[PDB]
Design a protein around this nucleic acid. Structure first.
Lengths: 441, 134, 184, 258
RNA sequence: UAUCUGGUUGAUCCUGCCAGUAGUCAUAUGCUUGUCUCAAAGAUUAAGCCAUGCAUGUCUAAGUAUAAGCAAUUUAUACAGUGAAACUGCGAAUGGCUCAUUAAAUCAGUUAUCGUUUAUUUGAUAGUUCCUUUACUACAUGGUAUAACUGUGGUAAUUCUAGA
RNA sequence: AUUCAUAAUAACUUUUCGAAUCGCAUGGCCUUGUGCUGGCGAUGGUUCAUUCAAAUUUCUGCCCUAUCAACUUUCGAUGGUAGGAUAGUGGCCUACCAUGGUUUCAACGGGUAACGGGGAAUAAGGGUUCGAUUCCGGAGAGGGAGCCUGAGAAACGGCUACCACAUCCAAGGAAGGCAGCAGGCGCGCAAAUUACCCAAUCCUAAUUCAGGGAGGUAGUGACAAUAAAUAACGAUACAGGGCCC
RNA sequence: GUCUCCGUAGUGUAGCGGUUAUCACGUUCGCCUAACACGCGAAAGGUCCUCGGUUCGAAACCGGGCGGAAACACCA
């Protein structure tokens, strides 16, 4: 046998992300009955009985008390076709950077959409996250995705087709403007809390014939969400390139040294291999590697593997570095880089010295635009003007920008997953771009 | 290879081990070394024996080149050679084949795992399978 | 738990390391005998101090002493064997009158110069280290060998050396092949 | 330490074994037997380093297992058998009988004896007692117990054990004018004649043994071994016969041999 | 290789100390680093705490087998060839690591056990044990299980164990 | 030097040992029979001696302190008698009796960045300092106590209990002591691979065969030591040292 | 990693969305000697941590980033 893929999940607040995620993990051999029954008892004492499924991924004390997904969390389950692990996105404008960290380490995406009356209109609004989360997915390199219409029992009347067809029509109009073809995307009606149309075909809604997709590789037609998870295409894994794994976390595991963990964006990580973290500049050797409490020999691209360093320290190591083999061309600090970025509406004007929190890959940092080289056409890199005076919404441009804080970045031609980024300012996605050139240190 | 001139020294006789020991002195002028099969071949007719009856080890080439000192043994019979020559030299030339008994690590783990069970384990295997079938 | 190997330091640094008179003395000796490190002079002086101390301890004992006689002739025999002491000076008193130059003269570097095969002590050093010179039937590449009046007749070019016949050599072949191909 | 010790590092082994200090950190500790570990010679070292018949440890084991050597009539099969003084190893193959006799220098030797000489072994008795059932017995240096001995046999004499039958055939009394063999001490391996002795009834009896070259030395009575009368040795003496030349005489002997 | 020097004073001779000097199986660190041989290496503060994987098990010609294990006996009708597991007999108190405790204590040289134990070895060492000892009793020879194994199983777990 | 070894008397034992074990080759006598004799061995066994040991013990010797001068004996201290216990001598313990024993010739008490020694550095000699660390003799398995088995343990890679730690829990319960080999955290100026092999040196078992992180090999390694590259040799342009014209 | 308290010349550190300044120390400058010294006579010294908005207008209104000052977390 079975392949390995990686999914992330996204959506508006109270759309039922963690409820749909956790209950789907329960159905597909995630945890036994006494573990989730314990979670029902503890959450009933807290007062949040509905969040018992959401608790499975939301393990922190502040998350369970508030009933809010603050930071991302990992959990695996084996489908009929292959292995897969989920990224539980926050779904808040407060924790939008944590979503960007999670979606950047994801191949596919499960866009959870609320079906209840009033909640869908709030989700796809100016202030809502349904517009933002779908836009941020295509920005970071999630080419293929799936949309899931949640809370079919909540809407009035219950399990009403007109409501499902209205949501699919409303999403299809918006999702074309982002870039995703809604013909290739599958639309599945589900209920996360009830557990309806996720594993087995639903009895409450016989009206639903079945979703369908029309790709170049192969067509698929499934009844449930689980079959739609099987129909996701195997991504292109660049195994031959130099390693470029931006670290995720660095743990000090009991009786086995320091253990750096991160997805192999490019290359093959293995035990007994020296690595260099980019911004801090710390060289160290890995003791061993693991993925969801299971050891590995070869950490292939797109994997939740986690090396472990040695002969150094947990502080020398850090979330954000690139273990480019100390033997191969390692990741270096970027003083200034040529990174085009197109913008998605900055309320203020974008001139110079403007340092938005560039969230290239898993790292967010303020970057000040040294200047603007050329005003460029919206596509094909066509040069329109030489040396602009200012820039506005709905316009492309190449721009050289200096970070206000030590950051590691790389060109799009060398590393496609590394080269993607977005821009944020005034609590909104002001611009989106890709880096073509970069000056090393 | 040229003017090998295999000259033997300190020849001794052991009817105890049915072998004769001798420090073999070999000179290799203008040539690097003499292969082990090379000295064994002409060791056969000087002692009037066969190729598969002699044993030589050592052959640390003298510094500067042109001389090598090693220690050699000759066995009377094939069966005597089997029962006296150590196994590592037997598999070395052509005399036997070294079977891989996995390695030391897995053998130790298997021994400990077999130590954790008291008996053959056929009844234990069927009992745990029946109990853990569900 | 194996028995540890024995190691010893074979040189003694001077107590006064900063003195013009001694500094020029070793520079003259090193240049005349072709020595790179002055530790080589430190080493050879250390051996002189040891044998002088041993010989001095022998001279405080009476004549016809089994300990003095046995070790006395053994040290004398070794010295006359290696060639630092002449045959008519075997009286255990000239042993205390040995100098560094006498020991330095017995080094194979100086003997190669003396027999006339290097034309310069520095050229003897490169000949020593490039394996173009052998002792007896053995190639020696150590400048300090201390021939002992018996192998001095055996000092000659090694059979496996371009200078003493044999295969012409490395840079010669590259030049010979270059000119042969140019002329062909 | 909580019981006996079965190990011998290759630094505390007796120095007369002539073992190196680089081939392994352990030494072939002799098993319990007729002689003490510090006064005997294991069969492994004797066959590997003295006779050079065997190279490795397993070669000695293979030779021993094949029923070839015969120590004191018995074949024996232990690689660490403590063969000491007055031990005869008989080899059916190679037609050699070897006798363990100390040398002048302070080690063992490879003295070869005829088949007739290997039929008898000299033994110095240590204790004479009246055992159970009233039977007298003697305790030789090798620990052999011989019942019903000659009444004239007392402490500190030597008997000629028949080995094959284990019976006493001849006894040599300890008195002045007796050729002896020093076993143990800084004066071990010397052969000389007894002139007198100071009794010293407090322990450690001393005897003044005089060499054939008028050299006299003092050795405790526990380290002596009478091997015959004056001028007639009951045993074939090793080469040199314990002249004990000085370092000067040895050097001239070497220079007269090379 | 039994060696000194600089510094109190305007200047001198002393006492006197500081500093310089050389070495360290005395370490730590810095800069640099091409080769051959040999080779120390979690002692100093923490004898502070440990994930995980190993570190002692074992048979011959010769203790016990019908593996309902494996080849072939054809010299073998009871096996008698090889031989897991188990019972049994030994070993596991050796080795390895550390220097916490301890200042006539340990330990070193040196005595005694005529004041004791001693597996394993080595050399020797039980004509006398049927007790109204003539029927009281097999002595070309006695009795009793039990493990492995077959099957029933229990606990979430253990080198966990029961009943037949 | 013995009430020593040993022997014999009169008894004591609920009674120790005095072969119901095993492998090969199977041979001789004839009163011609599963009749009677018969070898080379292994295992075990009571006692003695010996050996590998173990445990006590004679004499001498250990750092700094008197801003430690008296210590020990309540409830063991010194010695004697007798008895228990020990494998043995013995206040080792008990009952009684006597009041002794050590000390300025440095007792006793305190500190020790104190296991001791063989040894290491340093020097003419004298000596000073260090010595955990490859060898020998000791102590410990986190701090103590107790015990089975076995010749031998007061054993911890054997158990039992308590305290301080700490692991798995479907909350009843169960499993542990890396100052063993690697490796992890902490500590600090300060110290290596979670590798390979029983090929050597040995040890153990029933035993030639098997096992051994004992050990050896490799890797990290500028702790310390040995030797030793990085340059030499001709001809030309100058500048010389004796000397020839 | 999440959450909270502060950030202001050189040291001090005030002070207050239509506007950043003060105070001592200091920092220099004319002062004398020979250099001084005290004695003195005068003036050089802040993107209000960074970015982005709110903004007629902000450092202060708000939020993001960093720095420091405090917490709780962090079994591939």
């Amino acid at each position: 046998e079975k392949t390995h893929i990686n999914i992330v999940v996204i959506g508006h607040v109270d759309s039922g992300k963690s409820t749909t995620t956790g209950h789907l993990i329960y159905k597909c051999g995630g945890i036994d009955k006494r573990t989730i029954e314990k979670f029902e008892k503890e959450a009933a004492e807290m007062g949040k009985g509905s969040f018992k499924y959401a608790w499975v991924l939301d393990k922190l004390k502040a998350e369970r008390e508030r009933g809010i997904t603050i930071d991302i969390s990992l959990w695996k389950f084996e489908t009929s076709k292959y292995y897969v692990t989920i990224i539980d996105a926050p779904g808040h404008r407060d924790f939008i950077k944590n979503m960007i960290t999670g979606t950047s380490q994801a191949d596919c995406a499960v866009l959870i959409v609320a079906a209840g009356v009033g909640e869908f209109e709030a989700g796809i609004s100016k202030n809502g996250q349904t517009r933002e989360h779908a836009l941020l997915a295509y920005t970071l390199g999630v080419k293929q995705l799936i949309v899931g219409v949640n809370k079919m029992d909540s809407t009035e009347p219950p399990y009403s087709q007109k409501r499902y067809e209205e949501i699919v029509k409303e999403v299809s109009t918006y999702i074309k403007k982002i870039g995703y073809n809604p013909d290739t995307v599958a639309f599945v009606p589900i209920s996360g809390w009830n557990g309806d149309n996720m594993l087995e075909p639903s009895a409450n809604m016989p009206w639903f014939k079945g979703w369908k997709v029309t790709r170049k590789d192969g067509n698929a037609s499934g009844t449930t969400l689980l079959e739609a998870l099987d129909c996701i295409l195997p991504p292109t894994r660049p195994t031959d390139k130099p390693l470029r794994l931006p670290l995720q976390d660095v743990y000090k595991i009991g009786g086995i040294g320091t253990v750096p963990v991160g997805r192999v964006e490019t290359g093959v990580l293995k035990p007994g291999m020296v690595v260099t973290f980019a911004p801090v500049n710390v060289t160290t050797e890995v003791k061993s590697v693991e993925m969801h409490h299971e050891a590995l020999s070869e950490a292939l691209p797109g994997d939740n593997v986690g090396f472990n360093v040695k002969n150094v320290s947990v502080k020398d190591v850090r979330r954000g570095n690139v273990a480019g083999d100390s033997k191969n061309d390692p990741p270096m600090e970027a003083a200034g880089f040529t990174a085009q970025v197109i913008i998605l509406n900055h309320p203020g004007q974008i001139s110079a010295g403007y340092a938005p929190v560039l969230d290239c890959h898993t790292a967010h940092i303020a970057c000040k635009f040294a200047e603007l080289k050329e005003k460029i056409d919206r596509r094909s890199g066509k040069k329109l003007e030489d040396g602009p005076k200012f820039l506005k919404s709905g316009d492309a441009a190449i721009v050289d920008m200096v970070p206000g804080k030590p950051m590691c970045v790389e060109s799009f031609s060398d590393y496609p997953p590394l080269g993607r980024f977005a821009v944020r300012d005034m609590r909104q996605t002001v611009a989106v771009g890709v880096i073509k050139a970069v000056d090393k240190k | 290879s040229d003017a090998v001139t295999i000259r033997t020294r300190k020849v001794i006789s052991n009817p105890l081990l049915a072998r004769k020991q001798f420090v073999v002195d070999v000179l290799h002028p203008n040539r690097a070394n003499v292969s082990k099969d090379e000295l064994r071949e002409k060791l056969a007719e000087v002692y009037k024996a066969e190729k598969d009856a002699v044993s030589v080890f050592g052959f640390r080439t003298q510094f500067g080149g042109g001389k090598s000192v090693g220690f050699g043994l000759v066995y009377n019979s094939v069966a005597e050679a089997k029962k006296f020559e150590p196994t590592y030299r037997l598999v070395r030339y052509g005399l036997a084949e070294k079977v891989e008994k996995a390695s030391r690590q897995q053998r130790k783990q298997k021994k400990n795992r077999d130590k954790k069970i008291f008996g053959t384990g056929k009844r234990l295997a069927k009992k745990v399978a029946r109990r853990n079938a569900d | 738990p194996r028995a540890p190997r024995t190691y010893s330091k074979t040189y003694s640094t001077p107590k006064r390391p900063y003195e013009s008179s001694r500094l020029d003395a070793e520079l003259k000796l090193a240049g005349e005998f072709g020595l790179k490190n002055k530790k080589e002079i430190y080493r050879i002086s250390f051996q002189l101090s040891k044998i002088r101390r041993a010989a001095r301890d022998l001279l405080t004992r009476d004549e016809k002493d089994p300990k003095r006689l046995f070790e006395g002739n053994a040290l004398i025999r070794r010295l006359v064997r290696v060639g630092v002491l002449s045959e008519d000076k075997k009286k255990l008193d000239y042993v205390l009158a040995l100098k560094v130059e006498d020991f330095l003269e017995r080094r194979l570097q100086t003997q190669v110069y003396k027999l006339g095969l290097a034309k310069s002590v520095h050229h003897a050093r490169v000949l020593i280290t490039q394996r173009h010179i052998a002792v007896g039937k053995q190639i020696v590449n150590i400048p300090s060998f201390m021939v002992r009046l018996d192998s001095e007749k055996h000092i000659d070019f090694a059979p496996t050396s371009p200078f003493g016949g044999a295969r012409p050599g490395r840079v010669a072949r590259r030049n010979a092949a270059r000119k042969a191909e140019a002329s062909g | 330490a909580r019981g006996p010790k079965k190990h011998l590092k290759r630094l505390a082994a007796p120095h007369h074994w002539l073992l190196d200090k680089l081939s392994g950190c352990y030494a072939p500790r002799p098993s319990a037997g007729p002689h003490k570990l510090r006064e005997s010679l294991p069969l492994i070292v004797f066959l590997r380093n003295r006779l050079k018949y065997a190279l490795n440890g397993r070669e000695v084991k293979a030779i021993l297992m094949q029923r070839h050597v015969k120590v004191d009539g018995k074949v024996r099969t232990d690689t660490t058998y403590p063969a000491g003084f007055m031990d005869v190893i008989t080899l059916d193959a190679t037609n050699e009988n070897f006798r363990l006799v100390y040398d002048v220098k302070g080690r063992f030797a490879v003295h070869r004896i005829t088949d007739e000489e290997a039929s008898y072994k000299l033994g110095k008795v240590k204790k004479v007692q009246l055992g159970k059932k009233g039977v007298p017995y003697v305790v030789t240096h090798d620990g052999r117990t011989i019942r019903y001995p000659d009444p004239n046999i007392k402490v500190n004499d030597t008997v000629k054990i028949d080995l094959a039958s284990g019976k006493i055939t001849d006894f040599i009394k300890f008195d002045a004018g007796k050729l002896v063999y020093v076993t143990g001490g800084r004066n071990l391996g010397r052969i000389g004649t007894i002139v007198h002795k100071e009794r010293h009834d407090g322990g450690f009896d001393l005897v003044h043994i005089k060499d054939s070259l008028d050299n006299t030395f003092v050795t405790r009575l526990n380290n002596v071994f009478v091997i015959g009368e004056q001028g007639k040795p009951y045993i074939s003496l090793p080469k040199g016969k314990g002249i004990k030349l000085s370092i000067a005489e040895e050097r001239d002997r070497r220079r007269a041999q090379q």
